[PDB]
Amino acid sequence: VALLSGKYPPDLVTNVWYADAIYPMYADTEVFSNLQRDVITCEAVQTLV
Amino acid sequence: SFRVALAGWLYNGVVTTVIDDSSYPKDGGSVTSLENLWDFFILALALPL
């Protein structure tokens, strides 16, 4: 059904649409927290061994 | 704003007068939209001052 049915808004410009839709996603530090967690995990495993 | 821009010519080294962020076309823009083209035209005549 997804393959056979699909449409865009009547007017559309990909540049503007994506510049509007992606901006709210790029205000967060979760990935940086994940990197810090990965470092802590590696330090912990080396200390344990 | 016009008179403030005129008065700012005397204090180049102290204060910089720039066009507000909101005046620029929204989310990028496309030559595709009339509203957008006019924003560009308005910005183009006011930038040199």
């Binding site: 649409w17 | 929204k26 509203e35």
Partner: peptide
């Protein structure tokens, strides 16, 4: 009066741009 009553009724019944669509609006 009837003139403004008719005008108000017509405006209420009838009354409810160039820009690309966005996910916000």
């Amino acid at each position: 009066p009837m003139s403004t009553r008719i005008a108000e009724a017509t405006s209420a019944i009838v009354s409810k741009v160039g820009l690309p669509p966005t996910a916000s609006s």
